[PDB]
Enzyme design. Sequence first.
Site, PDB file in Angstrom:
ATOM      1  N   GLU A 191       0.863  -1.209   0.000  1.00  0.00           N
ATOM      2  CA  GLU A 191       0.000   0.000   0.000  1.00  0.00           C
ATOM      3  C   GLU A 191       0.919   1.288   0.000  1.00  0.00           C
ATOM      4  O   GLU A 191       1.901   1.405   0.808  1.00  0.00           O
ATOM      5  CB  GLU A 191      -0.855   0.060   1.309  1.00  0.00           C
ATOM      6  CG  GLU A 191      -1.964   1.124   1.093  1.00  0.00           C
ATOM      7  CD  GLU A 191      -2.891   1.266   2.316  1.00  0.00           C
ATOM      8  OE1 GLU A 191      -2.784   0.452   3.247  1.00  0.00           O
ATOM      9  OE2 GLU A 191      -3.783   2.115   2.246  1.00  0.00           O
ATOM     10  N   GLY A 205       3.352   2.406  12.203  1.00  0.00           N
ATOM     11  CA  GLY A 205       2.176   1.605  12.415  1.00  0.00           C
ATOM     12  C   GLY A 205       2.252   0.180  11.842  1.00  0.00           C
ATOM     13  O   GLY A 205       3.108  -0.552  12.178  1.00  0.00           O
ATOM     14  N   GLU A 218      -5.630  -2.840  12.624  1.00  0.00           N
ATOM     15  CA  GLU A 218      -5.414  -3.738  11.477  1.00  0.00           C
ATOM     16  C   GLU A 218      -6.492  -4.836  11.424  1.00  0.00           C
ATOM     17  O   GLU A 218      -6.928  -5.242  10.313  1.00  0.00           O
ATOM     18  CB  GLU A 218      -4.041  -4.423  11.534  1.00  0.00           C
ATOM     19  CG  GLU A 218      -2.792  -3.616  11.114  1.00  0.00           C
ATOM     20  CD  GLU A 218      -2.966  -2.263  10.585  1.00  0.00           C
ATOM     21  OE1 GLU A 218      -3.317  -2.059   9.409  1.00  0.00           O
ATOM     22  OE2 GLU A 218      -2.687  -1.340  11.294  1.00  0.00           O
TER      23      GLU A 218
HETATM   24  N1  LIG Z   1       1.817   5.287   2.776  1.00  0.00           N
HETATM   25  C1  LIG Z   1       1.783   4.817   4.063  1.00  0.00           C
HETATM   26  N2  LIG Z   1       1.916   5.561   5.113  1.00  0.00           N
HETATM   27  N3  LIG Z   1       1.547   3.501   4.287  1.00  0.00           N
HETATM   28  C2  LIG Z   1       0.222   2.929   4.183  1.00  0.00           C
HETATM   29  C3  LIG Z   1      -0.047   1.785   5.157  1.00  0.00           C
HETATM   30  C4  LIG Z   1      -1.122   2.326   6.168  1.00  0.00           C
HETATM   31  C5  LIG Z   1      -2.018   1.145   6.628  1.00  0.00           C
HETATM   32  N4  LIG Z   1      -3.255   0.926   5.785  1.00  0.00           N
HETATM   33  P1  LIG Z   1      -2.601   1.513   8.308  1.00  0.00           P
HETATM   34  O1  LIG Z   1      -3.655   2.712   8.163  1.00  0.00           O
HETATM   35  O2  LIG Z   1      -3.528   0.311   8.656  1.00  0.00           O
HETATM   36  O3  LIG Z   1      -1.440   1.679   9.370  1.00  0.00           O
HETATM   37 ZN   LIG Z   2      -5.475   1.846   8.515  1.00  0.00          ZN
END
Ligand SMILES: N=C(N)NCCC[C@H](N)P(=O)(O)O
Ligand SMILES: [Zn+2]
Length: 889
Positions: free
Chosen positions: A124, A265, A302
């Site tokens: 992501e 995270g 999560e």
């Molecule tokens: N571009 C980023 N900061 N990473 C995306 C990953 C974020 C995850 N969806 P979460 O919101 O669950 O920590």
């Molecule tokens: Zn998230």
Amino acid sequence: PKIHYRKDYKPSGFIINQVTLNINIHDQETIVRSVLDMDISKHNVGEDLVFDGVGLKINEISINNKKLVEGEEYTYDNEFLTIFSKFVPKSKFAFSSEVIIHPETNYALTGLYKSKNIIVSQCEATGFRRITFFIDRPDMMAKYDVTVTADKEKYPVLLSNGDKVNEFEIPGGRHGARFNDPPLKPCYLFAVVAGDLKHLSATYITKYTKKKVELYVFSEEKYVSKLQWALECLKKSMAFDEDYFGLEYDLSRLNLVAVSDFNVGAMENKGLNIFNANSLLASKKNSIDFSYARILTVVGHEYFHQYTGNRVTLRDWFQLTLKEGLTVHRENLFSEEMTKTVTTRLSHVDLLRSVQFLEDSSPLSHPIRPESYVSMENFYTTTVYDKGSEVMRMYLTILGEEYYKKGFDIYIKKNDGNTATCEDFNYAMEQAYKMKKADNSANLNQYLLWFSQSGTPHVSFKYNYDAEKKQYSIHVNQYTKPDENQKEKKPLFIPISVGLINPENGKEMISQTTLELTKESDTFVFNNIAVKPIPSLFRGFSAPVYIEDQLTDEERILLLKYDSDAFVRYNSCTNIYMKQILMNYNEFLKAKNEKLESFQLTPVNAQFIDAIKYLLEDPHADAGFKSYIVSLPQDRYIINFVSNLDTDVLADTKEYIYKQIGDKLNDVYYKMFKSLEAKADDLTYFNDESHVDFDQMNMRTLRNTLLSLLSKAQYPNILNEIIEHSKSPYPSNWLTSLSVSAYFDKYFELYDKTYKLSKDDELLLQEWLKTVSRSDRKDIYEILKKLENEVLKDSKNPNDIRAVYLPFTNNLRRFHDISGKGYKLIAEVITKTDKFNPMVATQLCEPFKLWNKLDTKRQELMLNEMNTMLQEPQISNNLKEYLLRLTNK
Ligand SMILES: N=C(N)NCCC[C@H](N)P(=O)(O)O
Ligand SMILES: [Zn+2]
Ligand SMILES: [Mg+2]
Ligand SMILES: [Mg+2]
């Protein structure tokens, strides 16, 4: 740099039905073979087939098992692979490719990368295109069949999404595992992990279908005994989605994996959640208390994504807040119910009104659904997440629990297995709103403005009481300042949870009431109000606004003592402090400007000091709450209220106010620091890995807060207490002993003692670095140089870089040194970092976000450093877009 616009969304002219991957990991390279089973969609118009693919080394590409020819049939420019349409089939076809990538030197931590001795993916938002060619956008849903092979001794544990269906030996000491995941998913939720991982596991039985679900939590062998809390949090998270939302996990296994190098995270890849080690691993011996709430929050978050992100998916990245704001809201409901402490909600509000309000009044201000982007990497912001969460929570406030649950279940039932947009959520809540009002003409069209309008609304009040008529009126006004995104701001639908407190006995005068303000202004009248009330406004912080209560400090003190709502008490205290801060700041500023040889300062209100002492001395009052009341508002909250903020004048203003209160209360603070020891530091459950007491950790917060106040004050003999505190088994305590010893000759002795206690656990060492970085030292610049030479060095680990630098950037006197040396130092680190990790480089820009709020000298110094960064020939696209937008250029 290409700009993507929300209103330009159109479905692809292609379909990808099936991905079959073979990922073969070798010492110096990973070879990725991929077959995509594709089709032409109804939107197709004979266009080129264009795949995303970034940084890939092509061995070969084919359509239907015939190699394509570079130049004549396709071009690849390290970003886009373009197959000219004359060579693209008109019905179902296979596209196949073999590329080489290099996770060992992937220090940006996107795509496939090596963290210590584990190989791990992060896809992501646009990382899948760094692994293989794809139409890398979340509306391209496909089935996945993935094989991974590797050296068996180095990588014994192989994981991907779905069921592990085959395991096989390979000659040369290698092995392989095949994973098939038939349900459709977007490519950003693909993950793979390979490593020598150790685990804990449990079985969870679902509430309704009684399905057995296997839960595995993994880390490197060194830290495997730090996994137990995370497993307990995962069980709690499953239970809560069952209990509050009626939602069960749909798959037979859920894996959580801790990695040391991660970008903040965790990540919700389907059945294979991957975390920053700092948000999965804890022990009572080697973690500070904050880790316990952090792991509960991140594991829960999560987990909650499995419905809000993974089963109901996004149509396009503009809808990000639909999964993130809603998951943060579900996370917050969960944490509130698990901790049972009022400080959980307060801490979320404290974050929003400091960090997110500063964002929303900065040149970076955006709505929670932005209209355009260059780098999706720069839109994972506090606005999208935390203001998005407050927008998602307002539907619960407006609807109440029963109808909110009905609306949420409408959203899930109708969109499960399909992509969705913010409108689909709003539609679902509207149907519940129609039901609640008992009128099918009621709508939430106005509510949509929370998704498109940027900036923080201001809500202000006037009152009227008529003693003869027993009639009370609340006059409310809203206003949002125009900004770059809207010239004309429209009034929002703002729910105002209110109470009316009888100032004579502290009692509630009316039932639960939420005012629905839907116009620029309105007057709410209440009859049969027997005495003039003090209004308790925005209970629970019921909308994400600047509240201008227009109450006197006498009325605020009465709410602080006697109101029933924790936020309103905390906010009343905050508003008393802000009125004092702005007054003293202006007195100090006038004395500096006029070069006065003498001047006066307004003292702190005595009845307010009395109210603080009354609360601290109440043995039935909450310790976490007490810690908030003896703390001034955060600097980043204060700055929203001051123009051209001189940081030295603000530092002198805070010093005065803290000294005024301490000169009255330090004996009370010392007495409580001592009387709280027994319960706060109780070791009864220290070796019970699953026993977590949030109230006890709030008692430690209060002790550590009081210890800081007493040390800054040089309370008689307090060094005796600091030294004894250094001997505590709890890292919250012994790291506190390090920070408060900054004011004594013993600081470097505790620096060495605590370094020794920290150096053998990677995460605890990072907490030590944050403690040193945040230390109130006159020689902090020399101390940072010592951390760089002795501990940090050329680490590329995001956790080490952030720990060394970010807390220091909060040092009001010293980071903002008028020479500009602090801004120079952070700019050098940003530019150095940007060479290998543009996301972290952008995170390290955070102190610059308030540049245009400071005094004109510091504005110029910050702008100088930003322009110097912008001038770096080797600047990343993410860092460049960020700094252009921040500097209005
Ligand atoms: N571009 C980023 N900061 N990473 C995306 C990953 C974020 C995850 N969806 P979460 O919101 O669950 O920590
Ligand atoms: Zn998230
Ligand atoms: Mg490459
Ligand atoms: Mg390390």
